[PDB]
Amino acid sequence: SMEQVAMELRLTELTRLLRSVLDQLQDKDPARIFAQPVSLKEVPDYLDHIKHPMDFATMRKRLEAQGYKNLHEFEEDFDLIIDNCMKYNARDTVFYRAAVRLRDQGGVVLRQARREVDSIG
Template sequence: MPKGRYLGLIKDYDGGTMMECYVHPSVDFARVPEMLRYQRAFLEDRLRRISRSHVVYPPLRDAATYLAGASRGQEAAARLLQIPGVKEANWTLADLVASLGANRDADRARTSLRTELLQVVRKIEDQNFAWPFRQPVDTSEVPDYLEIIKDPIDLFTIDKRIRKGEFYKNREMLRTDLVRMALNCKEYNDPNSTYYECAVNLEKYLATVFT
């Protein structure tokens, strides 16, 4: 902005950078809301030409009438296919059967992994050296624990993570937490303590479980 435009009209601060707002003469700023409405209508019209996302379908009334001819294994897919809008989105019965089958396989795999990991934790809990690891460390008894151990872990927390079903994707992720549990114990406790000895025994046991 040329200095002559503002000199004597507004305060000039040392080191300040003057800025101006330019009002374009061809834009009627009093009609901005109206212009935005026209722009929105234009965009919605173009979207309707290439998409059916604006279509609202009626609810499904009687699914049973659509299951004729579908095998027992295909009933779920047949029901989905009759949801208004599914066919219009180019889904076929074969597509839905394949999708549902993949989901069932994934569910079975998650259930199998959860069972396997829980068995590992149960076996560790049954060991004589497991008592320091069964519950989170009580920081009211050891106030400085979290200052030394930045990433605490214990069997109770691990059990909750397994049961939730989304945290551990494989055995190696569980092993990582269990190893860290032993390392935390060794880091915080004196090498001559019973706690340290339990951590060493845990490490030895993990070496036999994860081979």
């Protein structure tokens, strides 16, 4: 149906906007601490601690399959990146600190992304 196509075009345009958002958030991680999944070879207990691991490569795979239906879903995954790190790692670590700085810097990007999502529809 034409209605189905129109909905598909809206999801495509959302995907474009989310890709730009993703790029901007990942620029706020110049150390590439959040770029890839925590390796279970290197941190074998990780899944005892963290029940829903997340990282930027995993988000990018979801995104390119148009797997984010709205901005809330994308933000949920971004928050997992931060929140998982802040639980597993202590306050005195480069990991935790990186997460805090990513959260603080990413909030600015996401604030305007929400306005754009609402504005364009």
